[model samples]
Target: GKPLVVVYGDYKCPYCKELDEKVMPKLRKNYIDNHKVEYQFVNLAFLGKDSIVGSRASHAVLMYAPKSFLDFQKQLFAAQQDENKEWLTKELLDKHIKQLHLDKETENKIIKDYKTKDSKSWKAAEKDKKIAKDNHIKTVPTAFINGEKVEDPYDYESYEKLLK
Candidate 1:
């Protein structure tokens, strides 16, 4: 309960995808399931223009439809392509979002947030980027355990050893 796990990732970053697929499962199964550590995914969407779009949508879903975060996140990674590719589009994001089957109000809010420049969730995503900028964090999939920045975010065994 005391230790906070903050994982900073960019949906456009391939390594971030690895952290999501490989490391997240370990945390989900152990610490998160047992309620031992609080997990957080903060955006560091610096890859390109599409990264901003994806980051905004990601934060939108997390803020509005918190329950659907994991599913929506999975969809993001599943549909992810190379950073140079213009794979993330408004239409694609909305399609994945609508598939969540959220309530009309929540759905509308998320759509608006993703599209709006100064939307609450969009600003929240920007704020996360600001944090990364201020911290001089240039790479993605960076993680902090109990406020201590981890050297290797991919080490599942290291997480297992530290969380206790």
Candidate 2:
């Protein structure tokens, strides 16, 4: 059987951040790495204005450097604590670019060129959002196990019990 599971999330949600950092690593190590399951990270912005900005930036990052998206995601999540505004700025994101050793030129292009509008990354995100909405998705960190939505994401035991 094919590994079937999907995870929809955002970069700015604190709870999503917690799940990614504290739970996903363990889950991936125990299940994903062993081929028991597969995970797809679908970006769904939940933080309103910040979400649009952050998710668009993430889309750009994913388009340009899919491999480095995780690093960029983690860096953005970690930096949120210090950000005075709810939204992340180009200047703020540049800091993470430097930290991850991404090409400054590319980062600048992403920020300057497609930070908004119907650019390649934004188009992808819009398409993703439409799919999620058609499926009645309205939250971040939503999970579907074997294509079935999980009823209680906070129930850690319920997740672990799936291993059986």
Candidate 3:
């Protein structure tokens, strides 16, 4: 099995949400739940760079509580198009963690620990941007399976074939 599959997309992109809310659920039930694949969602930041911030916050979740990382990802994705200006704040994230039944002590540790290690993860996300450029990737909701780019993420049959 490949060590990682990169899921590239921008938070503000509508298609990205389609994939997150629609396409990904099927994949989760089929591939992810089976443990035949693992994904690292990469923020492309193509639209307006909100993805960079979002991905950074995602990295924070990954660092502190990897188990809750995907939950945080779902929350962020759901709030992408909302008009709330404070959706990007630490307070919002605190609420999110609480909603997930995580304790304040644990949530605080996650937030503060992320800040402590933010420099490295933030740099890594930026490096991913350069990697996308090197690969000539210009769109969101693109996925790479086992180091090779999947041309049509929404083409369920095609992607399912690739998984096999």
Candidate 4:
């Protein structure tokens, strides 16, 4: 069976940005595309409310258009406001989704999920946050491969050996 790769992080975490922008591309190429591992992101919204606000949009994207979720994440990281910042508003989230140029039907579905506030996307974030706190994980970009916590999430070699 392919291993499950779980990455726990906050949207506002700088190191998490680094992991997404730097390390993930390689893994996406060598592992994810080839199906060597199954990967998922657990966004633990601990960096105050701005990060929490962004999480719902991400969850919506994941729901309606799973393939484009990473591009939305790219938009989040591109801003790089870091912690305790007053960036990442609801409007900005909508703009990011629009900028993605996804099909109108998919686009509308993602936004509608937010407008009705019925998607429970934020709930998904909360549950993941609970999972993080329950695990006593205190940092962003913490990764678990094959159900084991990665000692060094930034090291590609560490990831390679585990997945290999």
Order candidates by TM-score, high to low.
4, 1, 3, 2
lDDT accuracy of residue 44 in candidate 3: 69
Best by lDDT: 1
The RMSD of every model to the true structure, in order and in angstroms, is 1.7, 3.4, 2.9, 1.7
Q: By the TM-score metric, which is better: model 1 or model 3?
A: 1
lDDT of each candidate versus the true structure: 0.83, 0.68, 0.67, 0.80
Show the colliding residue pairs in model 4: none
> TM-score of each candidate?
0.90, 0.73, 0.79, 0.90
- Local error of candidate 2 at 7, Å? 1.9
Candidate 2: segments with Cα more than 4 A from true spot = 1-4, 28-38, 82-84, 104-109, 150-164
Write model 1 residue lDDT over 1-164, tens digit each, in one string.
45788888888888888888878777877886567788788787777888889888988998899878877887788788988987889999999899999999999999998899888877887898888788777677788888787767888877776776
TM-score for candidate 4, residues paired by index: 0.90
Candidate 3, residues 91-133: lDDT per residue as tens digits?
A: 6655665666666776776556434544755666576678778
Clashing pairs in 1: none
- Please state the error at residue 57 of candidate 1 in Å: 0.9
Give me the runs in candidate 3 sitting further than 4 Å from their true place: 82-87, 114-118
Q: By TM-score, how accurate is candidate 3?
A: 0.79
